[PDB]
Design a protein around this ligand. Sequence first.
Ligand code: HEC
Ligand code: HEC
Lengths: 129, 129
Amino acid sequence: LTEELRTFPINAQGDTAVLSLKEIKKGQQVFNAACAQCHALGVTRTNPDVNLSPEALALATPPRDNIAALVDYIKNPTTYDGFVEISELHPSLKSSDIFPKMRNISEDDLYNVAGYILLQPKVRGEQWG
Amino acid sequence: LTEELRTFPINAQGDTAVLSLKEIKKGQQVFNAACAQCHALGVTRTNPDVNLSPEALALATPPRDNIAALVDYIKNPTTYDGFVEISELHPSLKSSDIFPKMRNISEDDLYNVAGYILLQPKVRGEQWG
Ligand code: HEC
Ligand code: HEC
């Protein structure tokens, strides 16, 4: 896994960040623990269109195709059109009541899961999402 | 439990229906199995304002203060302002994927749970919601 594949847009301004492989291993864990229930393989079980594929992410509002945007999303989940807050029903830090796995999640983890999500299509191609 | 307390508005047109106590016992079961996780005591764990109290229900869009409206809600969940469908994240029949307890739910059950929900404030007063 070259440093190239591990280079992702950290924000929407185009800035790049190189994540360590270790962080990605941790992102996967958090992901497999708190997201795989409805997102295994980068899909969205109950909403096929709003996937974890680059295309879907890029077309979200705002685009969720960069680490910052993905981190924001977990901290403050919103519908695809991004105008209705769904933190009450979607896993988030203010939703840890009905989502036990969100009680010990830290920014570092959010950062890692974000890198993990963005990594998958680079390595699994269209198998992801 | 007189037949009076068991008289509820079946629809928004003001029609009344008298449910049997037996049906209410069954509604409670379905409720305790599929709703108590976020609605025990008629509350909404992750959204305090959108409760199961008569006032909140009556102020929903459309009002969810009659059996038909409540049944519709479970079949097709929508935000409080009733304009965003949240069946993908809220228990419903098209949401039974992530909500196992919704796989064997029948209209009869929906009808019973609806009666149960509407019964609680009549017997628990403000303790409910
Ligand atoms: C089921 C209970 C879910 C779990 C567990 C997680 N997510 Fe989810 N997510 C879910 C739905 C039904 C939706 C669509 C909401 C809508 O109406 O738009 C989503 C969406 C996302 C997205 C946005 C996808 C996109 O814009 O294309 C992301 C970034 C996302 N979810 C990430 C994510 C993560 C990291 C999770 C774990 C912390 C997670 N989700 C859990 C349903 C569910
Ligand atoms: C995982 C959590 C969860 C479960 C389980 C759940 N609900 Fe909800 N429910 C919510 C949330 C959160 C809302 C608020 C949605 C909104 O308006 O944004 C809600 C709202 C509702 C409302 C509308 C309340 C109002 O005042 O308008 C009703 C009716 C309702 N749920 C009934 C049920 C019933 C019946 C079940 C079971 C079949 C159920 N819910 C299971 C989380 C849950």
